[PDB]
């Protein structure tokens, strides 16, 4: 599950952080 | 009158009457 | 004020920076090709090329390099299990390294064009405003493409200057990289003829040059210029997308149905070869001929090479995997080592029995032992079910001819029942499921994964063609 766990983790961190950065810059 | 409207209506109605006659006669077919 | 989905529209009216983003994309694609090629070399196992080919190892990019004539590696091993005396500059490691170097070089060229965006080249001499002569530009690029198409099929494929391409035995037994003589008659249009590839690229390339020259000299008619909105650059995008997804479908179909450009020895056997018993018919034809020579039945089966018998196996079927059964084929049912030999079943009174092979549709198929005529004789009850023709009651026996266990015979119902289940799967093999902790569930070969990937992209790109086509034709209303 090492590859399964990391895939889930990255799919959360990478997009969510990207969205948050844009929102901060907008405001 | 032979405009497009005539062709469109007769292109659907004419076969429909034929089929309806085919189906109605086709209820009574002895099994 | 740009929504998150229009952030890239800033380069619509900026040819200088348009070249930059296109350069950056090309750098990313090249970087992937080199990185993926390097990844596969670190995992490829070139020990056994008969029972453990590269399509059995989940290698996606490696087959494409080998298709055009790269066989040796700097590690001293050849794809065919040779010694690789003279790897040369062009080896798997070299080509992968070459792409990365090119990937980096494009990255630098991307930064330069991004910074220096305002160039006199992109400015109309008549008026200082930026402009692009799309009808003429297409002439230059098409002219270049025609030359490459002719160059590829006249030198690289024919062997005049290049190595050639991978040609193979109809049954994928003997394969190698050989020059291809162009075929010019109607015989050159059938898919499975390598001569077509050489002939096509010569003819298509020549016509590409003539058309490229034409589009330079002859300007578009005023009617078409405005009907097709040749002034805008969207029209080039929408039309280009249309051509791309047309190519994706053709490549997807040619890969799924097999062709001269996708040899089974290189990408894996086709699904339709198992449905029609392509290899089974060949094996039987070979065996019967040996029997007619007066040879024994035991040695006749031993004459069949293990490569041929390893294709007659439902596990080597692209249409048996799962969407989330990730990984290489070997991770499904272990590593194929050794062939146990043809299995012959006989009942007590003498008649031989045949096991009904599993249709490619079914994932769980009942085990049926059919008589020569076709009437079911022996069975395997579903489970803990009352039986009238189970193995014990009819007491069938299994004998192995050829292969590892040639000449042996078994009668224990437990052992016969075990080999009956393996018989419906095709030829019987011995698998090492401990090296990779194989699960036991069939995966899909690179032929299956390539087809799935490119048909999905083909549909998605159809929507893109519609969307970008809609914006072009309706430019005034969308713009304002």
């Amino acid at each position: 599950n090492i590859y399964g766990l990391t895939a889930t983790a990255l799919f959360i961190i990478i997009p969510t952080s990207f969205l948050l950065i844009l929102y901060v810059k907008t405001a | 009158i032979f405009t497009v409207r005539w062709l469109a209506i007769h292109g659907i109605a004419v076969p429909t009457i034929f089929f309806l006659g085919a189906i109605t006669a086709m209820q009574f077919i002895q099994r | 004020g740009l929504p998150w989905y229009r952030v890239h529209t800033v380069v619509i009216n900026d040819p200088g920076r348009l070249i930059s983003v296109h350069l950056m994309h090309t750098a990313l694609v090249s970087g992937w090709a080199g990185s993926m090629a390097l990844f596969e070399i670190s995992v490829f196992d070139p020990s056994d090329p008969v029972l453990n080919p590269m399509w059995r190892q989940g290698m996606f990019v490696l087959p494409f390099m080998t298709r055009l004539g790269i066989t040796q590696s700097w590690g001293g091993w050849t794809i065919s299990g040779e010694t690789a005396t003279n790897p040369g500059i062009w080896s798997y490691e070299g080509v992968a390294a070459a792409h990365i170097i090119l990937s980096g070089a494009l990255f630098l060229a991307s930064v330069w064009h991004w910074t220096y965006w305002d160039l006199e080249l992109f400015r109309d001499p008549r008026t200082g405003k930026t402009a692009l002569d799309l009808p003429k530009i297409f002439g230059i690029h098409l002219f270049l493409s025609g030359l490459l198409c002719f160059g590829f099929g006249a030198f690289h494929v024919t062997g005049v200057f290049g190595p050639g391409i991978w040609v193979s035995d109809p049954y994928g037994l003997t394969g190698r990289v050989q020059p291809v003589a162009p075929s010019w008659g109607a015989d050159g249009f059938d898919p499975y003829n390598p001569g077509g590839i050489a002939s096509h690229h010569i003819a298509a390339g020549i016509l590409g040059v003539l058309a490229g020259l034409f589009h330079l000299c002859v300007r578009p008619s005023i009617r078409l210029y405005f009907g097709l909105s040749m002034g805008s650059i969207e029209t080039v995008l929408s039309s280009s997308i249309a051509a791309v997804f047309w190519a994706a479908f053709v490549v997807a179909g040619t890969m799924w149905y097999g062709s001269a450009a996708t040899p089974i020895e290189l990408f894996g056997p086709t699904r339709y070869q198992w449905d029609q018993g392509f290899f089974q018919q060949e094996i039987q034809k070979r065996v019967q001929a040996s029997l007619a020579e007066g040879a024994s039945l035991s040695d006749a089966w031993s004459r069949i090479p293990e490569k041929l018998a390893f294709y007659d196996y439902i596990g080597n079927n692209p249409a048996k995997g799962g969407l989330f059964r990730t990984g290489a084929m070997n991770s499904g049912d272990g590593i194929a080592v050794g062939w146990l030999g043809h299995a012959s079943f006989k009942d007590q009174e003498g008649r031989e029995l045949f096991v009904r092979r599993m249709p490619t549709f079914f994932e769980t198929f009942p085990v049926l032992l059919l008589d020569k005529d076709g009437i079911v004789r022996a069975d395997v009850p579903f489970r803990k079910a009352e039986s009238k023709y189970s193995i014990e009651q009819v007491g069938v026996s299994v004998t192995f001819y050829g292969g590892e266990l040639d000449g042996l015979t078994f009668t224990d119902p437990a052992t016969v029942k075990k080999y009956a289940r393996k018989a419906q799967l095709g030829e019987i093999f011995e698998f090492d499921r401990s090296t990779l902790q194989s699960d036991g569930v069939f995966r899909s070969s690179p032929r299956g994964w390539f087809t799935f990937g490119h048909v999905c992209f083909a549909l998605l790109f159809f929507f893109g063609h519609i969307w970008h086509g809609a914006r072009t034709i309706f430019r005034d209303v969308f713009a304002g």
């Binding site: 889930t8 969205l19 844009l22 810059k25 907008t26 | - | 009216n13």
Partner: protein, 38 residues
Amino acid sequence: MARPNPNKQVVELNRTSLYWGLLLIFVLAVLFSSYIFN
């Protein structure tokens, strides 16, 4: 180059866009995690 691009703009997404984005990411993860884990 000294001259800036006349056609230079700034991306921007409001809070509603953030909430849709976060919900889409998490809901997709909820649906597909079982299959990825397998």
